[PDB]
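hey can u run this one w/ iron/sulfur cluster bound, need the structure tokens asap thx
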Amino acid sequence: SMERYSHILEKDKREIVLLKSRPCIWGKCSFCDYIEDNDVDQKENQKINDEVLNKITGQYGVLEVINSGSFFELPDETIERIYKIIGEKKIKRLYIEAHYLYKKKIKALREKFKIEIIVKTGIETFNDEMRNNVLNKNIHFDKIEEILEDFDSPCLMVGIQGQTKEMIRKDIEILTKYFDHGTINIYRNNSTPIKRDEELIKWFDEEYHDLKNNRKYDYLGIPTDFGVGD
Ligand SMILES: C[S@@+](CC[C@H](N)C(=O)[O-])C[C@H]1O[C@@H](n2cnc3c(N)ncnc32)[C@H](O)[C@@H]1O
Ligand SMILES: Nc1nc(=O)c2c(CN[C@H]3C=C[C@H](O)[C@H]3O)c[nH]c2[nH]1
Ligand code: SF4
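ok here u go:
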């Protein structure tokens, strides 16, 4: 079965859980097959999720919740249990993920949970045409500062056919200038038709080696590097 509970042991050490949610409200990104873990039956998702949530201890004071979609697609009972656990285990910082289409719901979530929330979002690349015409993310912003109104931490994807060195260089320039957290995901081939560019990945691995050790940004050479998921 799938690993759903682990610890992140570098940089901002924390517990992480990979939970089940109803279908991603977008669900059409050309490269994504994590949504295979979605399920329409929220009562079964809640039962599965509750066994994972029992493992949270708050031992680092920091927790990350991911769920192959956005936080808001979790069962209502899962969300309210996470809220309970935050208070009971004295957790002071929570990471969640939400697609940009949920931007306007973030403020109310922050006000409900009260603690520091780091909201991650799957920008993938700041290049508009690659993001929306190739990766089909449906993420539209006019200025970088618009993202920062509600999101804290862009997930970036590196190493996809159709990218260029210039495109990747600009993404890292933007990440490092504007954002206080972020995630660098080296692309992994999967069941979708979107494929790794091995030459770009080789180049990035050597040219941006100093990124691996940058305290602000999590770096995943393989998607399983947090210890959850297949
Ligand atoms: C649940 S999504 C992000 C949250 C939200 N649904 C969104 O898209 O904005 C998880 C992230 O994993 C990364 N990812 C997906 N497929 C990948 C792959 N094949 N290789 C590397 N990273 C991948 C992407 O950066 C994606 O944003
Ligand atoms: N279904 C499924 N969901 C996943 O999230 C996943 C992962 C790790 N994805 C994480 C890595 C960086 C992002 O923060 C986060 O989305 C590996 N295998 C998986 N399978
Ligand atoms: S990358 Fe995010 S928005 Fe796109 S299908 Fe996957 S979980 Fe849904």
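Residues 1-230 form one domain. anyway lmk if its weird
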